[PDB]
């Protein structure tokens, strides 16, 4: 194991990616809040930051509705032979009545 190299731990590589996304999101929320709160900023960039704040507070609602529609879309394509490949339908071994019906078909012709 000592002669073997060391490896990048993926389980912490994902966590400081999602956490960095959340930190950048919180910094952008606290940055588009300050751009409208002061009065020295121009109105062309005072209302634009307001709608950018509206669009940033509306993010997990968008995730909720987006998730909902995609869950229904995934339920459209569950067909019980994808998820259940060992489905037993029906079978019937050959009875004596089949051979009797065949012999009757050859006798009455």
């Amino acid at each position: 194991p000592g002669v073997l190299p060391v490896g990048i731990d993926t389980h912490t590589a994902t966590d400081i990616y999602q956490t960095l996304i959340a930190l950048n999101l919180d910094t952008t929320v606290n940055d588009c809040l300050d751009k409208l709160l002061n009065d020295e900023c121009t109105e062309s960039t005072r209302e634009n930051a307001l709608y950018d704040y509206y669009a940033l507070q509306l993010l997990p609602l968008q995730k909720a509705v987006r998730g909902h529609v995609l869950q229904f879309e995934w339920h459209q394509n569950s067909l019980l032979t994808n998820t259940h490949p060992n489905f037993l339908s029906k079978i019937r071994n050959i009875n004596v009545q089949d051979a009797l019906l065949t012999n009757q078909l050859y006798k009455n012709h």
Partner: peptide
């Protein structure tokens, strides 16, 4: 409660 913030609190959330 300050009037610099009262005009913006109902602006950021209309509820």
């Amino acid at each position: 409660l300050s009037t610099n913030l009262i005009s913006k609190i109902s602006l950021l959330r209309p509820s």
